[PDB]
Amino acid sequence: SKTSLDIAEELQNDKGVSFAFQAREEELGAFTKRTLFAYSGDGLTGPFKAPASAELSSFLTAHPKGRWLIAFPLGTGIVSVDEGILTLEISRSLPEVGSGSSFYLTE
Amino acid sequence: SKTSLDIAEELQNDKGVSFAFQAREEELGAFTKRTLFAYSGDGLTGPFKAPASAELSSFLTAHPKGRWLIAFPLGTGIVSVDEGILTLEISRSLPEVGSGSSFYLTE
Amino acid sequence: KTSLDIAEELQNDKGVSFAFQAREEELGAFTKRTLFAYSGDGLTGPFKAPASAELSSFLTAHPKGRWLIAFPLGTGIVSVDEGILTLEISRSLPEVGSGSSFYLTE
């Protein structure tokens, strides 16, 4: 059970909302698990959009669905990347985002 | 901290739905944590049933409640095993399952 | 680099039992702190119990001063005041189950 990628970065939009993301990749024999962790202390009225690093973009793009369904305490999000820009869309406005994670396992 | 077990396997039901499960055991001094991770890209209309490996079955049986309450983004499930058949029951039909985990800690 | 990984069991005056695990990890310029919580019990109202010195300072260190946490059937907020942990819940919970709350900081 080896970790082959473990990166973290802070993204911010133009309205001053900020998120921290962590991308982790693990090998488990025949399987690989990829996990995205997300944290913000801010509220979100609508989608969060910000430039992501190339390594984070590459990680995000690799998902079989091409996006990441993610549960936060007060609502549901989908994280995607397009031309190096990360978007997190939310199911309802969130007074506070808090933390969540989203993973897939593949062989 | 030390990991004594970390296994993964893919299960499929008769109607084409597939889940990946990872079972992890960690020792934290006097405590042991056991975590089940579950992922499916598919939707679930009703309960998911499929044969589990002996090692996964033994892991799932060890829970103090004899089953695993698990949150997915769009609803709640309960994972149990009976005679080596894993069943995941869900609180509502799910257009997409996504990922979730369920753990317990014991002394 | 895991720089902290502690676990303890807490019980209230009504025999509800919780296990907590506090983990701190270092990822380059970032620190991640995760609180894991588990109870097999139901919870009618807030859970209060004394926490270790180490668990208390870990819980105090959050930028919001409290930990928003998702469980399968409802939402909680974990906080500490003078070594007493409180977990407040958004609705009564027939069973608590497991959840975790983390933050990532530069």
Numbering used by the authors:
A (entry chain F), B (entry chain D): 238 to 344
C (entry chain E): 239 to 344
Can I see the authors' text?
Trimeric fibre proteins protrude from each of the twelve vertices. These fibre proteins have an amino-terminal virus-binding sequence, a central shaft domain, and a globular, carboxy-terminal fibre head domain involved in initial receptor-binding. The SnAdV-1 fibre head is the first Atadenovirus protein structure to be solved at atomic resolution. However, it is significantly more compact, making the 107-amino acid long SnAdV-1 fibre head the smallest adenoviral fibre head structure known.
The structures of P212121 crystal forms were solved by molecular replacement using a trimer of the determined structure as a template and refined using NCS-restraints at 2.7 and 1.9 Å resolution, respectively. The two different crystal forms belonging to the orthorhombic space group P212121 both had four complete trimers in the asymmetric unit. When the structures of the fibre head monomer of the different crystal forms are superimposed, no significant differences in main chain conformations were observed.
